[model samples]
Target: MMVLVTYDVNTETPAGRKRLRHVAKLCVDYGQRVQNSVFECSVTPAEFVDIKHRLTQIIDEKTDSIRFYLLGKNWQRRVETLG
Candidate 1:
């Protein structure tokens, strides 16, 4: 499966900035960085769950936002436009 992972971690505080780096590191291990805060992850369901769990643990739920878009195995064909 292909997972599009995007995140925004509140960088108003030092800890928030730290969290942002941690989140990016985790995503980098599983995918390619598409944007500053977006990653394109091609992984299995188990890997997806593991990454999601790790990201959930690293982020502050009260101030940070993390989103996952499941693009499935056929994402290459489904994606119609890109830069």
Candidate 2:
């Protein structure tokens, strides 16, 4: 599956900064960062579950948010771009 994952964390404190970097590092292990705080991951369903669980463990629910868009196999066909 192709998954588009994006995250936002309040980076106003030392803990928040650490969490932001840690989350981005975790995503890099799985895929590419097409944009800051946004990643494109090609992973198996099992891997997706693992990634989600791992991230939740580190993110502050009160101050951060994460989103995932599953693009399946035809992700290349589904994505569109324009200048």
Candidate 3:
């Protein structure tokens, strides 16, 4: 399975800035950094769940936004239209 993860974390506070680094590090362990705040993760269903759970624990829900788009097991269906 593949998951496209994107996040916008508030960095206007010291705590928020720390959270950003923590979140980015977590993302790097599981995926490729396609952009500063976007990652393309290739993981198993269990791994995805683990990553999602871990990220949620570090982000401030009231201020941050993180999204996951499941791309199933097909690559061609996903990469057909690209940059």
The weakest ten consecutive residues by lDDT in model 3 span 74-83
Q: Which of candidates 1 and 2 reaches a greater lDDT?
A: 2
Write one digit per residue (lDDT tens) for candidate 3, span 13-69.
Answer: 898889878888998888888777788888888998898899989998998999988
Per-residue lDDT of candidate 2, residues 1-83 (tens digit): 88899898777789988987888899999899877678999888899999999999999998899999887677778777665
Candidate lDDT (C-alpha), each:
0.85, 0.87, 0.83
Model 3 C-alpha lDDT versus the unseen true structure = 0.83
Q: Candidate 1: count the clashes.
A: 0
RMSD of each: 2.4, 2.1, 2.7
Ranking by lDDT: 2, 1, 3
Error of 3 at 41 (Å): 0.6
TM-score versus the correct structure, for each prediction: 0.80, 0.82, 0.79
